[PDB]
Structures are given as structure tokens and as C-alpha cells.
Design a protein around this ligand. Structure first.
Ligand code: G4P
Lengths: 50, 51, 76, 50, 249, 230, 228
């Protein structure tokens, strides 16, 4: 139960937030962005993934 | 008396020995499972949440 | 290999006589007739015997053949 | 009536306040419900059960 | 006290017999943590020798579940009290009101899955203040019967026990009131007659070699249960008629 | 290229309550220092607290004195709160002796040179009898953090005197700590912030010394941490 | 009074850029105080050098396409964002790319200057097709602390500059990722002690050990005002 709640919150998308439309070079940079407070944990974004 | 030496011997015996945990209504075969014990303070048994 | 015994079952497909083989080996180790064939990681002889089974170094055939070999050697 | 009395105390009328995570110092999103509840310690004491 | 009650808690507290309530209201003349002495009002005073009313309170006695039942005085010197006022608070009672437990600051939120299921997380601050520390008064009984091999005795002479453990017993063999004990410690020294040891041969050899005169008395002393540690709060002694009481009795 | 924080005015609103400000903080370290300081302050600040009590006519916490109203247990609970500032020695034995009717407060404690009773008005017990007299010896130690009665038994060291009454030691004077980072616009500079640390204590540690001691401990840990010997 | 100083700090650098560091034993609660202080300062305030702006000689907006480059302008921007440049003396320098012909335009193809060192000469930038294969651009590298997104420069770019000047997010901090786990560790009798596992991946320029060391150095240096 608790896990599923956390993941639901983490993955869910929102109309508008901080960092709408930023292009990030990878997931580690995504995490660096969230932890620095320059973007909301959920905000629609274009990311490069392998 | 139970001085540090006893705790070291207990740690060394416990290392690879597994213990079985059971809950009174064993409905199916997964009601009994074996786990590797980790010594902790307190009197409560700590079991992994997922299981 | 005290996480998943999957490789030993891939070596021995019965998954039950596996435990008997490992018990024979680990008791051959406890009563010090033999010595460990793998560098110990401060493990007990159970997971040592599992580690010996999973790498193909020890199975039922090696136990019986080497056992009768040592027996016939000890006959003299 | 609860709203009124909370106003008399000069506290947020919605009854939730923002909390800061004591380990990292970051704020929590979405303020959380805090307040006093009356709790009881039951006779089932681990000291006896072990 | 409950911060959010229903109003019935005074009825519950008063109606139980754990509170002490004034029968003829008056002025509290003397207050001690054992008795409350009140002078009745001239109004309610019976014509012939009314005098004052004295309320003896009950201090830590053991409840059926082993919890503490002690009443503490509420009022102070010179307070005027009326008929039916709450003199002393019983266990889990405040100023007359039912205080079953205590009220804490709770926050509804998940904190790294330590409250995963209905489990509850708690802060060191509550334990620091000792607000959920309970007193439990347990009873222990040592009974010395008379077997056909000979009557048992309570003496302090206990074969082959270190004198460290005896240190806490008086010459009579009963713990001193107020001594702090732990699991395993000896509370009442008691020995029992037993003979015909029938030692095995090798023991015979050892007795010969070292000169180990076997003592014919078994150990029985009432030691504390495992993992319990507290203060001996009280002791009682019941001797049958006929037998010579011992010093402590 | 950095700046550094220097201790500027340190106001004291009440004897217990004090606000300490740090003016020239570079952007981003406001929160870092706020939180680090908060943590160290709450956890590690060395303070004084009563460790044990001996009253003459009392064998154990549960008995009761003639002519007093609080139970022995309540007197212990009241002594736990006694806020005392000892300068030189680590272990002081204070002696409280009072007779007659009246509330025996902390001021009645026999005043020693090295000990300062922060709030002499703190109540301890209430006598109720003209001839009722209490004498006691309170042994107060210095220590950091929180040690309960039950753990300290390790150092028992022949606790033989049944008169000795152990009290849980809450060896920590800092009660509450909050920090506020607010932009400190200095007429010639772009992005600097001020730290305002508001701290409420039992009136033993003075604010400057608290902050300094915290900075000391953090600096020592970082000293060990910077060098890396693989 | 007397604290407990940590010993046995072992560091197993799998993949020179990826360093795990174990640290024990630490007094209660200091696991997170140091993990967080380190992380925050390390990540947000770290002097570094990085590409800030880019100029294509041919296109006016970052969403248009250039003839014969398969990757869109977005892709080349992202490739330049990752480019690790280390300048010794100069603070801001202007690097030029001019390449022709078929194949992958790589970081090697930058004009080789003195003070600027490209840590990865083989980092792919763009793929250029055949027979036309004309690529020309100017990349500006500047030194700064932390992370500054494009959107704040474009916001505060009151100094209007000519067309083609495509801003890219400036990733100054050489630390790409950092995290800290706290775990239970007991010194033979005290169990209320903790272990710190610091996993850090940096982008080549600085070695992880040096990153940690200078981060802690600067934090202590700020603390300097008070330490008696
Ligand atoms: N559930 C879980 N397990 C993890 C995780 N990370 C590592 N493990 C496993 O735990 C074991 C680690 O034990 P060791 O590193 O050998 O150290 P140890 O002496 O405490 O056993 C490994 O399995 P092993 O017993 O060594 O298997 P094998 O490689 O020997 O076959 C490893 O695969 C994890 O995040 N989650």
C-alpha cells in the first residue's frame, strides 16, 4: 500500500509546474534537477534514455 | 554474565544459520518461511514489509 | 550463493537430491575428513557446499568416484 | 464551530500546516494535518509477550 | 486529562470508588500524602460531637492486573470544600476527570515506511519525559512446607552460592526493604532436606581426591524471574501457630 | 570566490529565549548551515542535570514523608527539572534543608560558590506541618545527551547504600531551535542571505557559546572527513 | 565533551568516474547531517567550467533543421551540454567548430587551443552527411558555480544580442550524481551508531576524491569564523 502510493505520486503527471519543456541529457541529470529545487518532481519533459 | 565475548560467539554462530518464521494461521505453504536473522536491540521481531 | 540456489538447480535438476548432496559434502567437511575446495568467506559449510555444487566442481558423480578412490587408497 | 475556534487561536482554518523534513531540511509538498489526539497505552506490553 | 471529552468523564470518575469525595463539606484542616483531615461546617455539624472527618488514602497497593492504585491529594491547606467535592485523584484521574491516557501531537503522513501498516512511530521526546512509564507491582511467594524428610528452613545458609548474592539478605534471610534486584537474584533463602545422593563412581573418586564433603541440603531460594528488575516495596510473613517466629518476623 | 558569515548582533528577548543572526551568507548555504546547526544544537549540546538524590528517611521511591504532600516519586520528578549552572567541578553535592510550613523552592538550596540556580523560584515540595523538616543531598553531574537510570547501572561500582535514589539524566539544555533564511539586501551586492537562529533553552547555555560549540563539533567532523586515506 | 572520530574509510572506484565511499562509525544522527551538507554544497555550489551559449551560422531558432545533419538542433544542443571543458587561466573563452565531409563531428574536431582542455576528445557531437557536409558554429564556455537553467538567462537577457544566439543550460558543477545511504553500524558495544555510504559519479574533469575533499574544505572554510 504505502509503496504504491509513493510511486503513484512520483510518476504522476501535472499540467504545469517548474521546468515545463526542459531537455535533460539523462535520468541522473533529472534527479540532480529535482534535488536542487529547480523543477517539480512531476512536470512534463523531454529526456534522452538508453 | 554475558560479556562482549559471548556476543561475538553468538554473532559468529548466527551468521549463516537460518531460522523459520511462522504465523499461527498457516493457510498455505508460504505461512512458514525461512529467513536469515540479523541481531537487533529490542524485544520485537522485525520482518521485511513486502512479505 | 546464499540468495538464490538457481544455479545449483541448473546443475542438478531434481532440486531435492541437491540438498542431500550438499548435506553429504558439508558433513564430510564438518567432521574434518576433508577441507574446503573454495576460498571461504567466513561462511559455514552449508553455503560452502552450495558454492561447490553450483560451479560444477562437485556433484554426485564426483562425490562417489572420489570417495571410492580415497577408500581404495586408504585400503593400503 | 471548529473553524471559528481555530480562527480565535490565529491558526490556519484548514487545519493543515507545512512541515519541514527534520533530516534533510527540505519542505514537504502539500501541507499535512497536525494536531493533538488523545492516545492510550494498552495492556499488551511486549515485555510480557517475548 | 482528555483535551476533547464528552462530559461524562466526571460522572465515571466520581461514581467509581477510586476517587475520595467529601461527605460533609467544610474546610481542609490538614493535608498529607496519607490522610486528608477536614473540619465540617457549623451548618452541617451534627449537634452531639460532630468533630472532623479524616480520609485515609491508599498508597501503592497491587491491583488485580499488577498495576499501581494510589490516590494523591488534590487540595491544599485552607481550601474550602463542599459536600461531594473531589479530594484525592485515583489512578488515571485528574481533578475529578477521567484521564485514561495522554494527548500527543500527531501528524498524519508516511515517514519512510516505518508506519507502513497500522504501526505507529514515536519520538524520543515522549520517552524523555517519562509520560508513558507504567508502575507494575508484582507479587512473589516463598512457602516453606514440612516434608517427611524434614521441615524446610528459611536460614541464610545456602550451599555453594557466592557471598555477592547473599550480600543483599539480612541475617534472617529476607531482602531488605528498598533493595534493587534483577533477574536471577535471591529474594528468600530456603533450603530443603535431601539425602541418598548415590553419586556415580567417578564422583566418588573426586570426593576422595579433593575432600569434597557432600552437603545433604538442596537449594530452593525464591529467585527473581528472568528479566525483571525493580525495588522490593514490601514484605509480609505468615507463620503457623506453634512455630518460633524468626528475627525478621 | 566566496564570502563568510560573521557573528553580528545577538539579541536576548528573555532570559531563556535568544535570537542569533549571521548576516553575510552566500546564496545556498542559508539552509545548509541552518539545518546543520539545528541538528548539532539539539543533539550534542553539553549541559548539567541532576543525577541522583538521597533523602534520609526514605528507603525507596514509593514511600512517603510525614508532613509533605508530594510523594517521593513526585519530588524526584520535580528535581529532574532543576536547572543549575556549575562552572568548575563535574560532580556537585547540593544540600537542601528546610523546616516548617511553606513551599520549599529551589532558592532554599544551600548556595555554593560554583553553582548558579537559574530560576530560584522553582518549586520542589510543599510542607504542611510546623515541625516537618526535610534534608536531602542532590548529586548533579555534567553530561551530554540523554542517559536513563537503567543504562547507568553498568558503572554500578558498589551501589550498596540503599538510600541512593537514581534519576534519569536528561543532560541537554537546548529545548527548541528554528532558523529563518531571509534576503539581507546589502546596498552593494547581488545575492546574500541572513540566518536568524531562534533558540529556547532552560537558561544554562548562553547563545554565543552554544553556536560556537556546534560550529566546533561540525568543523572537527569535517576535518576528519576532508582527508581521505583510502 | 569528547566525540567519536570515524575510522576505516575505504573507497572502491569502479569506473574511475564512479566512486563509492564507506565511513564509520559516526555519532547518532550525524549520518544525515553530513550526508546532506555534503550533497547540497557539492551539487549546488561547485566552481566549474561549462558551455553556456552556442551560435549556428545558419539558423535563427533552435527548433529549425539544418540541411544534412540528421540530428535536430535539440540533439546537438544536448550533446554540447554534456561537453566537459577544463580551462586553466582564462575565465570565458570562445571555441569554434568548422567541419566538413561525411562522418561524425566529434569533440576532437574543435580547434586545439592552449588553455582549454577537452577531457573526452572522442565525445560524439553531431553526425554530418555526405557531399554537402558544412558545419560551422561558435560555442562559448564560461566558469561559474552550480546549475543555471536557460530559462533564467533568457528571462534576464535584457542585453539583446543578434539572431542565432541559442542559449544552453550551463552545467558548471562537475559532479553528475551524488547520494548517501545511512545504515546501522555498532562499535562492538554501542549500537546507536551509523555508517555513511556516499556514491558519487562526476564527469571526468575532477576525480571524485577531489570533489569530496574540496567540498568539505569550502564548507569548513565558511565555518571558519567561529571554530575556536
Ligand atoms: N535483496 C537484495 N540482495 C542484495 C542486494 N544487494 C546485494 N544483494 C545480495 O546480498 C549478498 C551480499 O552479500 P555479501 O556482499 O557477500 O556480504 P556478506 O558477507 O554480508 O554476505 C549478495 O548475494 P549473494 O548471497 O552473495 O549471492 P552470490 O553472488 O554469492 O551467489 C548480493 O547479491 C539488494 O539490494 N537487495
Amino acid at each position: 500500500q504505502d509503496v504504491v502510493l509513493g510511486l503513484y505520486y512520483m510518476t504522476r503527471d501535472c499540467v504545469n509546474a517548474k521546468g515545463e519543456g526542459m531537455v535533460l541529457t539523462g535520468p541522473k541529470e533529472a534527479e540532480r534537477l529535482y534535488r536542487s529545487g529547480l523543477a517539480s518532481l512531476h512536470a512534463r519533459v523531454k529526456v534522452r534514455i538508453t | 554474565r554475558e560479556e562482549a565475548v559471548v556476543w561475538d560467539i553468538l554473532d559468529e554462530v548466527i551468521r549463516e544459520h537460518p531460522v523459520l518464521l511462522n504465523r499461527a494461521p498457516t493457510l498455505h505453504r508460504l505461512g512458514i518461511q525461512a529467513f536469515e536473522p540479523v541481531l537487533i536491540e529490542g524485544k520485537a521481531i522485525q520482518l521485511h514489509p513486502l512479505v | 550463493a546464499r540468495v538464490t540456489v538457481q544455479d545449483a538447480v541448473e546443475k542438478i535438476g531434481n532440486r531435492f537430491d541437491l540438498v542431500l548432496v550438499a548435506a553429504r559434502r558439508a558433513r564430510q567437511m564438518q567432521v574434518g575428513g576433508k577441507d574446503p575446495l573454495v576460498p571461504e568467506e567466513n561462511d559455514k559449510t552449508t553455503v560452502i557446499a552450495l558454492r561447490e555444487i553450483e560451479e560444477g566442481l562437485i556433484n554426485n558423480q564426483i562425490l562417489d568416484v572420489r570417495e571410492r578412490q580415497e577408500q581404495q587408497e586408504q585400503e593400503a | 464551530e471548529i473553524k471559528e475556534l481555530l480562527k480565535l487561536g490565529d491558526l490556519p482554518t484548514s487545519g493543515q500546516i507545512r512541515l519541514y523534513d527534520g533530516r534533510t531540511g527540505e519542505q514537504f509538498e502539500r501541507p499535512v494535518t497536525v494536531g493533538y489526539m488523545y492516545m492510550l497505552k494498552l495492556n499488551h506490553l511486549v515485555d510480557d509477550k517475548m | 486529562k482528555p483535551l476533547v471529552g464528552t462530559g461524562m468523564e466526571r460522572a465515571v470518575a466520581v461514581d467509581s470508588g477510586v476517587t475520595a469525595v467529601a461527605k460533609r463539606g467544610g474546610v481542609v484542616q490538614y493535608v498529607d500524602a496519607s490522610r486528608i483531615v477536614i473540619k465540617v461546617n457549623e451548618d452541617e455539624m451534627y449537634p452531639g460531637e460532630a468533630g472532623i472527618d479524616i480520609y485515609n488514602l491508599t498508597k501503592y497497593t497491587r491491583s488485580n492486573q499488577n498495576t499501581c492504585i494510589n490516590q494523591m491529594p488534590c487540595v491544599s491547606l485552607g481550601e474550602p470544600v463542599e459536600r461531594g467535592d473531589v479530594l484525592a485523584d485515583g489512578p488515571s484521574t485528574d481533578l475529578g476527570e477521567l484521564a485514561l491516557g495522554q494527548n500527543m501531537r500527531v501528524a498524519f503522513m508516511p515517514w519512510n515506511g516505518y508506519n507502513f501498516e497500522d504501526s505507529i512511530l514515536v519520538s524520543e521526546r515522549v520517552v524523555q519525559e517519562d509520560r508513558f512509564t507504567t508502575i507494575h507491582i508484582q507479587e512473589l511467594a516463598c512457602v516453606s512446607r514440612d516434608t517427611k524428610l524434614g521441615p524446610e528452613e528459611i536460614t541464610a545458609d545456602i550451599p555453594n552460592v557466592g557471598e555477592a548474592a547473599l550480600s543483599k539478605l539480612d541475617e534472617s534471610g529476607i531482602v531488605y526493604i528498598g533493595a534493587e534486584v534483577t533477574g536471577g537474584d535471591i529474594l528468600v533463602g530456603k533450603v530443603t532436606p535431601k539425602g541418598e545422593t548415590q553419586l556415580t563412581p567417578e564422583e566418588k573418586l573426586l570426593r576422595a581426591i579433593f575432600g569434597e564433603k557432600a552437603s545433604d541440603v538442596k537449594d530452593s531460594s525464591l529467585r527473581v524471574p528472568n528479566g525483571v528488575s525493580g525495588t522490593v516495596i514490601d514484605v509480609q510473613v505468615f507463620t503457623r501457630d506453634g512455630v518460633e517466629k524468626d528475627k525478621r518476623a | 570566490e566566496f564570502l563568510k558569515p560573521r557573528l553580528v548582533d545577538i539579541e536576548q528577548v528573555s532570559s531563556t529565549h535568544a535570537k542569533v543572526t549571521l548576516e553575510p551568507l552566500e546564496r545556498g548555504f542559508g539552509h545548509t548551515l541552518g539545518n546543520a546547526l539545528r541538528r548539532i544544537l539539539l543533539s550534542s549540546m553539553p549541559g548539567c542535570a541532576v543525577t541522583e538524590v538521597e533523602i534520609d528517611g526514605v528507603l525507596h521511591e514509593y514511600s512517603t514523608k510525614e508532613g509533605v504532600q508530594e510523594d517521593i516519586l513526585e519530588i524526584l520528578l520535580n528535581l529532574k527539572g532543576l536547572a543549575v549552572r556549575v562552572q568548575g567541578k563535574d560532580e556537585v553535592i547540593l544540600t537542601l534543608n528546610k523546616s516548617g510550613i511553606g513551599p520549599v523552592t529551589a532558592a532554599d538550596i544551600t548556595h555554593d560558590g560554583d553553582v548558579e540556580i537559574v530560576k530560584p523560584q522553582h518549586v520542589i515540595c510543599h510542607l504542611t506541618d510546623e515541625n516537618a523538616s526535610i534534608s536531602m543531598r542532590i548529586k548533579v553531574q555534567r553530561g551530554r545527551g540523554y542517559v536513563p537510570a537503567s543504562t547507568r547501572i553498568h558503572s554500578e561500582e558498589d551501589e550498596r547504600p540503599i538510600g541512593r535514589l537514581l534519576v534519569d539524566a536528561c543532560y541537554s539544555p537546548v529545548e527548541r531551535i528554528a532558523y529563518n533564511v531571509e534576503a539581507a539586501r546589502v546596498e552593494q551586492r547581488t545575492d546574500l542571505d541572513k540566518l536568524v537562529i531562534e533558540m529556547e533553552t532552560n537558561g544554562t547555555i548562553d547563545p554565543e557559546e552554544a553556536i560556537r560549540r556546534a560550529a566546533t563539533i561540525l568543523a572537527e567532523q569535517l576535518e576528519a572527513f576532508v582527508d581521505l586515506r583510502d
